[PDB]
Design a protein around this nucleic acid. Structure first.
Lengths: 105, 80, 123, 78
RNA sequence: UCAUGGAGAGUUCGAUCCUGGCUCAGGAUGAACGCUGGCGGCAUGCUUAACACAUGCAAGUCGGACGGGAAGUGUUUCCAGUGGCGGACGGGUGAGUAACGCGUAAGAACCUGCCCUUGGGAGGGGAACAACAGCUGGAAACGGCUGCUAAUACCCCGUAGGCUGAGAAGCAAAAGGAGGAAUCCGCCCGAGGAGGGGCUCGCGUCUGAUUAGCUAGUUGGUGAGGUAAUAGCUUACCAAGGCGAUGAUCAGUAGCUGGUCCGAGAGGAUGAUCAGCCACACUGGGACUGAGACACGGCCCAGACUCCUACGGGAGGCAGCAGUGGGGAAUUUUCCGCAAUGGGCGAAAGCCUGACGGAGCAAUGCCGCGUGGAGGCAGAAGGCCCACGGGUCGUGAACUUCUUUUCCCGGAGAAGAAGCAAUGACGGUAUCCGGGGAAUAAGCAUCGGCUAACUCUGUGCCAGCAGCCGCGGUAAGACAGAGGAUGCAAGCGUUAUCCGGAAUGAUUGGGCGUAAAGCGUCUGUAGGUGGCUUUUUAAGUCCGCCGUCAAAUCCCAGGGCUCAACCCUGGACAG
């Protein structure tokens, strides 16, 4: 080709990293989506509370998995992962804040 | 960081140089926290102000080539 | 006008040095296109036939400019170069025309003060 | 810097007070001492200020667009 | 002691005093035009159309990250591609922006690759994607299946002074390369610092009331989200707030500041080069990666415009440097060089820099220098004027000698370049030495008053001049010519813009009986100013100390260019 490209080389790599980061930030949105979804269900109609937390904790661990994994690669600064893990445990602390775990400062 | 570097300060065909410790992103004739040094390559002195060069090199502003070479003429280098 | 409140509202301001040439409005002298090369008379105390070229300018105005010197080449639709300076005798003529510049020749046979009329040296 | 002491105007907003701040200033060209008023929105989680009391403004983290101060109390050395 | 600064004149009227307006004398231009033009030193060189742009160049680099192939015949040079940083710096313009954009001064809610300091870590696996080979589509631009490959390229498991959470609990990383080794460059996770950014706020920041109401995510509150971080940043609900006659909103103008110019001073105008911050990159709008952009020479879309096409489609952004065309009164060379300086990359070697260093043209400006020095019978030739005696051009010239800044003809010849040597575009430039030779070199305004310089000839209210007053109808100190004189000098004048003068917008510094000007008078709101004594705080005020107001400029004093201009070093009042 031409003897010097230098910027189309960039835009090629930008297309690639657009694909990877677009994709795996979407994985993060899907797993946080499932965690908040099942939390919404056990807020709605569960009727036994301290037992089924193992599933919510399991998927929440997958949420903390892909969250912090995408914290390692440069697509999320610190205080992005902090704000969203703190978001998920705000939601968990609210679902237990309505009910049977009693928490007070 | 900061990079201790000369800057041309004179007429045409004169080359009276200052030694300024400015940030490396600036243009070559910008502004400094403290303009420490002097270098007159035709024939004259070179005021150096040793404590301030030891302040910035103690901080870790690496110099350029010939600023480092002026710093190798005198015995400025102490690692303390 | 007390120091208190009739004057820390405002005194007033004088306007500007009002422009003594409303055309030429960038800067000093400006290319012109001759439209009429007629001749008018001054006010009552004088008596002459002063020969002015009403000239369209490249600025956007049209203005009647005086023609100095004795001889003049200026026919219809020639190109001149007007400058400022008020001829008193003529109501309306605000401007002069430079001589010796583009398409307006120097005056005929003048040997005293040639830089005002665009005539090169003899001898 | 200094605080900005001044009267409370109207507190019909929760945690929020408008404050007149009266400031003398030398007018530039003519040498008097013209007052200029400028009123602010201050913060109070206690909201323990009625109309007409006078507070001191201190800079803090911005709470809203205008609410960039919280006022506590003056010293009161008379 | 301080003081280093303040000028008038013309014109109203038969005259006088006065008010008042105009005009001039002074500086400055990024200047333009006219006449004239020797050199040198240092600056400056589209103010207009942010108007289109032909051509070349303006951003690369790394083989010591990796795989291949292609010249050279164990050995090396290259290379498109995947990667690594750099393309967010440097350069250009001022269209917008009357606003935390800028200037100055504080603050907390943040980020930060390269850079220093510092605590710990780098086991194990695995899948491809370019390249490439084949087929094939296209005029090109680009592609598309089929297989294959490597890594500091991607993915998974373990492990972590980190994170989430009240705890419980969980969650998260790595990369090798060079070298015989030694070791070095790295990588991952932390913790600081410097510098760089992102925010917030006090104060300062143009005119217009013949623009008086504006604002409904609007101003608050909570909850949910969001951002690197606070935030109506965003959304649902609640509250009705918030701004404004001290000018809100609207309209118009304008990049801002160190500064420049003027002024005695207070301050008035202004923001070229120099420097800092902002914004834009054909007109609009988006997002992507990275530490950092909503990116001038990146991507995607829309709009307009130019080029190519084989008619299906492509390609493009000079407000980078040079340059062309247009507009304009007017603003240059399609130059040389990376030698320095400063960037970017690399372990080094080096490479690339239209930044920058130089060169060319232009009296565009500021400064320096020359066009001769000394004598020259007081005799001649001539112009102009004359009471015809003469005067004046005029020591001027002619003429005799002296000298060579410059000019020509030759020789030498730098530093700038950095202690390993080598390394110079400038350039055989600067400078010096020698040989002729006064040789090669003065113009332009003005001469009625301001305003220094005046008589004569021609013209006869004509031609004309003119900054204001006004000259010009037969003897014009004002037009035109000559002589002479004046002031300047490689410049001299006119014009335009700005300040002065102008106390003619007045704080310093004006006025209102009659000159321009007191509301028709009165009540009174906002607001402004306010009696005396004693006491208290100190907001103003004053004093000390401290921080800052970048550097450059101005002021003082030194120093360097043969001086000056200019450059450099140090210092500081103000405020």
């Amino acid at each position: 080709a031409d003897s010097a490209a230098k910027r189309t080389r960039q835009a090629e790599t930008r297309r690639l990293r657009n694909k990877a980061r677009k994709s795996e930030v979407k994985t993060r949105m899907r797993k946080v989506f499932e965690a908040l979804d099942a939390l919404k269900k056990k807020s709605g109609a569960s009727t036994e509370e301290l037992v089924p937390i193992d599933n919510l904790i399991a998927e929440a661990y997958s949420a903390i998995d892909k969250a912090v994994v995408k914290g390692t690669l440069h697509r999320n600064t610190a205080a992005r992962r902090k704000s969203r893990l703190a978001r998920n445990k705000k939601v968990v602390e609210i679902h237990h804040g309505w009910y049977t775990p009693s928490l007070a400062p | 960081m900061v990079k201790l570097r000369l800057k041309r300060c004179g007429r045409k065909q004169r080359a009276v140089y200052r030694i300024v410790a400015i940030d490396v992103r600036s243009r070559r004739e910008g502004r400094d926290l403290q303009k420490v040094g002097f270098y007159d390559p035709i024939k004259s002195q070179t005021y150096l102000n040793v404590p301030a060069i030891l302040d910035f090199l103690e901080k870790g502003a690496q110099p350029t080539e010939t600023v480092y070479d002026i710093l190798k003429r005198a015995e400025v280098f102490k690692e303390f | 006008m007390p120091t208190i409140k009739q004057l820390i509202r405002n005194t007033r301001q004088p306007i500007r040095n009002v422009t003594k040439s409303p055309a030429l409005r960038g800067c000093p002298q400006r290319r012109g296109t001759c439209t009429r090369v007629y001749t008018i008379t001054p006010k009552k105390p004088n008596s002459a036939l002063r020969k002015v070229a009403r000239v369209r300018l490249t600025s956007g105005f049209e203005i009647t400019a005086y023609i100095p010197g004795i001889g003049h080449n200026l026919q219809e639709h020639s190109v001149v170069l007007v400058r400022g300076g008020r001829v008193k005798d003529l109501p309306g003529v605000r401007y002069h025309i430079v001589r010796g510049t583009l398409d307006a020749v120097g005056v005929k046979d003048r040997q005293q003060g040639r830089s005002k009329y665009g005539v090169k040296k003899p001898k | 810097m200094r605080s900005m002491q001044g009267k409370v105007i109207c507190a019909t907003n929760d945690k929020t007070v408008n404050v007149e701040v009266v400031r003398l200033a030398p007018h530039p060209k003519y040498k008097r001492r013209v007052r200029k008023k400028k009123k602010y929105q201050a913060h109070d989680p206690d909201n323990q200020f009625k109309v007409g009391d006078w507070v001191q403004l201190d800079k803090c983290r911005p709470i809203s667009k205008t609410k960039t101060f919280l006022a506590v109390a003056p010293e009161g050395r008379q």
